[PDB]
Design a protein around this ligand. Structure first.
Ligand SMILES: *[C@@H]1O[C@H](CO[C@@H]2O[C@@H](C)[C@@H](O)[C@@H](O)[C@@H]2O)[C@@H](O[C@@H]2O[C@H](CO)[C@@H](O)[C@H](O)[C@H]2NC(C)=O)[C@H](O)[C@H]1NC(C)=O
Ligand SMILES: *[C@@H]1O[C@H](CO[C@@H]2O[C@@H](C)[C@@H](O)[C@@H](O)[C@@H]2O)[C@@H](O[C@@H]2O[C@H](CO)[C@@H](O)[C@H](O)[C@H]2NC(C)=O)[C@H](O)[C@H]1NC(C)=O
Ligand SMILES: *[C@@H]1O[C@H](CO)[C@@H](O)[C@H](O)[C@H]1NC(C)=O
Lengths: 533, 538
């Protein structure tokens, strides 16, 4: 019998599994329950801590995926299927996973906690691309990831009601972080060194824990990959949240908040999933119906307000974007776009694309967008229009919110490191015109190219090892730089003035200035003034 | 006794002129021909009355008086400013025009160039040295005409609806002179069927207004707009704002002893000494500005049936040829006239707060939101506080808003709606230029080359500049003759392509051969011409 795979946590006993990597074994405890199953009367409610169990919980395999829509845009295509549920769906989905070195560390090891993205309507900690075994073996960290409720189950809100208060998916994440404080030492993890990292909605989540005092004592450093809590898709106001909840109810044949939630609770989960898409007020390339609500509780103000008011001395943050944030999203509803052709769009398609990529702004606002993103020496060139609409979508939803977060945090005491990830994977299944799309740095951060069964180049493996080192250096010390490595070119901090970041690719680090500074001045400085007056 | 070449009879009577020496040979000049009754006394603010016929011979032998105007004193004695100041005495008795013609008089009808000076509708004169028509006439054998027209309150004070100060009488001065050319230019050997207007700044805006006013449009055939457009934001005013300005001027000079009967008010304005009106005209502007233009053409349904912007958009311009352009640094000259931090005598390396303040004075009368948009577009957000860059950007702001983008818009619409259009950017800095080097090629400093002033032996231009001057005179007179500036039958010479709304091609005018380029500040002017007006509506 293997004692390394037996662990006792506060709730009871667990049996793990030994995993192989090209670099040696790793211990994994997959499918650890951290909440009571949020089912029946507990749907829409805050998570309750998992009650103690007798006997030994089997933690040798990933547990169920939280209920969510399954993307069928390109059935069987790797580029979309790699994000889809790879376990059965269930509301009984509140489990987390721990990877640790083998044999288990006997002194406190830094902890990385992964929060997946997926627009708050999808995702799972069990996706292959979030496999913690390579990071843990290579960099000797403990790695934790949790499932949290998404869609209506995580973020349906009737603000003010006890029956559906909203943000319970974020509370799922917080409960997992509390679980890590209480239990990670039993795995050799150090609860006093916890680094949160997340991508997209995962990054927005990390940002929200930064801005919510009860979460802030549960970790020490933060990594935000291609997402920010101040992204225009990441939150919703109380009034609009109530409207969307009410629309969902009507669409599933339900009619007083108590009566409305009770009716919603009688519906099969799959039925809520089936209707969640058409509660949105405007058509969009984004499928984001239920998201965190600003209601004074989890978030006492908008993330923008909270960010401007905040004292961030003592914080270190690693943030960045991929080279082409907008391109991936354009095939989910921008007219003229497909992964299977060149998507050379016309100016009419461009104008249409703008209304879909930048939903819910005024005509005046949209005009200003078309102004700033047209090359007036080539206003109708299809390739330039394709690139420009990609820019519009990426700038608005990802790059400029991250740049704004970076600048404010740095000016208010945080130490910030910024990157742009610029390597197109040799294995990438999306067409060449999409460049380095959203989501495709993750496989490199998690060291997936080390997996011999996959087909990355030797150069790509060394690159992955570099990225894993940057990330783990940051988790250990707040600084990704090779602690003492004199003659390696250094990653300087990002500042509101000099705005320096590094390019992450197969070449040595190159320092540059400005995260699309000209474009983000538009989104971050001018457009808010417009939507006012 | 008398020289027959210097004698001409026009509809009003007989004229005697003068034989002018030029480096290339003699020219006949008839300077100071009266074309209207003096707009004196009861005739102040009224439309011009045609000059009554006279017996005997009028000596048209020297420039007549400059129309009353403010005299610039910012840099006293400095050439860069004094070259624009009156060089004859001020008088309300100023409605005279000038004809230059080859010596001997042409024997077959000759293309006529008609010059309209700039000066913001508050200043200027046809007698300035830099507008001397003798070099063009000698070198290109055209007939050249220029006129004085009333400026300031005397030409553009308007109490819309009133018969006593209807407004736009300065433009009517120009029109009357154009009618005079139709009726009389043949007597000098000029061709009334080939008349090309040209003008710079307010003169270019006047040229454009004649394009857009049907009773003027019949009096000429082609047009040249140098650094100005009728759709310029400084170039017209609405009826109510014109009346407000007129009324405030009246008030400030004690009339009446505000508003009331227009007849009474104007009668009281007519008793004030000219100089008193001039001394107070700076007071009537609603905002502090670097374009101190108190009285300007008024959009009132008469001379202009609609805004020039609207008239441009709605117009059929088939059969028209037009030549338009700008200098390289349109904005710099205006900044030393009041933008905080600026001086011709230092480098004008301004702060960000000075830049922000400059935007308000260089783009007056726009909302805070609009000013924000301007700061956004013109800040380099990787270098938001670099003084040199801020100086350059403010110069671009002022130039783009007031000159380049109105010209680009005029050019694109005319081209798209039937006109043949040629566009240039003037990029040569005169070896003789007295403004500092940071100003680059400032507003107004192409004019001396177009008029061939470097050929004046008393001046000290380089030989290359004399050659350059001759090239420009050739383009302008080619255009006047044929509607096309290109050398008819010359092929190894670089060609000047027409400007169109799509390709937006123009040429650079400098010591080097023509270089063809694309877009008149196209990214910048998309902001001024396409977006910013939409922000006005919302
Ligand atoms: C590029 O493809 C898009 C998407 O169309 C689909 O994908 C193609 C690869 C092909 O399989 C098509 O048959 C599919 O319909 C094209 O945009 C479509 O254009 C057609 C034209 O009639 C229109 O009916 C669809 O609604 C369009 N789809 C969207 C999402 O707008 C686009 O025309 C292609 N580009 C080309 C052909 O140059
Ligand atoms: C650049 O010059 C301006 C203009 O000031 C005048 O011209 C200068 C060349 C020099 O002779 C000054 O003494 C003159 O007053 C300067 O702006 C002025 O600054 C003074 C004092 O700081 C102030 O009282 C005025 O109001 C300013 N005028 C304007 C229009 O802003 C400017 O500071 C000079 N820059 C330098 C010297 O670096
Ligand atoms: C202004 O006063 C004049 C002067 O007597 C007179 O003709 C008339 O009543 C007034 N004009 C108008 C238009 O009312």
């Amino acid at each position: 019998e293997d004692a390394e795979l037996l662990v006792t946590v506060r709730g009871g006993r667990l049996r793990g599994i030994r995993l192989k990597t090209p670099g040696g074994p790793v211990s994994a405890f997959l499918g650890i329950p951290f909440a009571e199953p949020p089912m029946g009367p507990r749907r829409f409610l805050p998570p309750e801590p998992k009650q103690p169990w007798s006997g030994v919980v089997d933690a040798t395999t990933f547990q169920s995926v939280c209920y969510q829509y399954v993307d069928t845009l390109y059935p069987g295509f790797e580029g979309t299927e790699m994000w889809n549920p790879n376990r059965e769906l269930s509301e009984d989905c509140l489990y987390l996973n721990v990877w640790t070195p083998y044999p288990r560390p006997t002194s406190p090891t830094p902890v990385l906690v992964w929060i997946y993205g997926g627009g708050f309507y999808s995702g799972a900690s069990s996706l292959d691309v979030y496999d913690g075994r390579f990071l843990v073996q290579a960099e000797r960290t403990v790695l934790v990831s949790m499932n949290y409720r998404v869609g209506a189950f995580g973020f349906l809100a009737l603000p003010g009601s006890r029956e559906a208060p909203g943000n319970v998916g974020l509370l799922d994440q917080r409960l997992a972080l509390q679980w890590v404080q209480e239990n990670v030492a039993a795995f050799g993890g150090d609860p006093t060194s916890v680094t949160l990292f997340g991508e997209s909605a995962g990054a927005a989540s990390v940002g929200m824990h930064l801005l919510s005092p009860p979460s802030r004592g549960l970790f020490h450093r933060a990594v935000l990959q291609s997402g920010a809590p101040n992204g225009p898709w990441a939150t919703v106001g109380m009034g609009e949240a109530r409207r969307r909840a009410t629309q969902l109810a009507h669409l599933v044949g339900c009619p007083n908040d108590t009566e409305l939630v009770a009716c919603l609770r009688t519906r099969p989960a799959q039925v809520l999933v089936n209707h969640e898409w058409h509660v949105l007020p405007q058509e969009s390339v984004f499928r984001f119906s239920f998201v965190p609500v600003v209601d004074g509780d989890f978030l006492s103000d908008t993330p923008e307000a909270l960010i401007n008011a905040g004292d961030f001395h003592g914080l270190q943050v690693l943030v960045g974007v991929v080279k082409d944030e907008g391109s991936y999203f354009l095939v989910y509803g921008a007219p003229g776009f497909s992964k299977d052709n060149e998507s050379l769009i016309s100016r009419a398609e461009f104008l249409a694309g703008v209304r879909v990529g930048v939903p819910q702004v005024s005509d005046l606002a949209a005009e200003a967008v078309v102004l700033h993103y047209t090359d007036w020496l080539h206003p109708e060139d299809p390739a330039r229009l394709r690139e420009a609409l990609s820019d519009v979508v990426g700038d608005h939803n990802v790059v400029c919110p991250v740049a704004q977060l970076a600048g404010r945090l740095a000016a208010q005491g945080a130490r910030v490191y910024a990157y742009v990830f610029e390597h197109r994977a040799s294995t990438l299944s999306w067409p060449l015109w999409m460049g380095v799309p959203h989501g495709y740095e993750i496989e490199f951060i998690f060291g997936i190219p080390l997996d011999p069964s996959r087909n990355y180049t030797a150069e790509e493996k060394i690159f992955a090892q570099r990225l894993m080192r940057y990330w783990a250096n940051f988790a250990r010390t707040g600084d990704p730089n090779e602690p003492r490595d004199p003659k390696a070119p250094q990653w300087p901090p990002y500042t509101a003035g000099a705005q320096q970041y590094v390019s992450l690719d197969l070449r040595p680090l190159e320092v540059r200035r400005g995260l699309r500074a000209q474009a983000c001045a538009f989104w971050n400085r001018f457009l808010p003034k417009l939507l006012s007056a």
